[PDB]
Design a protein around this nucleic acid. Structure first.
Length: 48
DNA sequence: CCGCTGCCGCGAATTCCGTTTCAGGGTACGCCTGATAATTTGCATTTTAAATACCATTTATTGGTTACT
């Protein structure tokens, strides 16, 4: 759908294409993400 | 036949500060079924317009008349 429209799809249009209610799509989008490692260097210098 | 090379380990200052909390894998689909997580009623304890059943010590009405502008 992104290559067809040439941009990113809004959740409403995506919901239209999957034939599912908007809230279901939103719930899946928020569930999807995976946890972040506690050792990721947040400081530019790899100290902190 | 006890010498030298070559591997692999190990280590390299101190506080603060700053900052974008941030992204990237490229693989299917439709059944039965039990398995929870939702939703529906009744029964224990309060709290009940109040209603109720006794003790209580402290003014109220009081018992008014005998003196007298």
């Amino acid at each position: 759908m992104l290559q067809e429209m040439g941009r990113e799809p809004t959740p409403e249009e995506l919901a239209e294409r999957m034939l599912m209610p908007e809230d279901k799509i939103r719930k899946v989008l928020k569930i999807a993400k995976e946890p972040i490692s506690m050792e990721t260097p947040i400081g530019d210098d790899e100290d902190s």
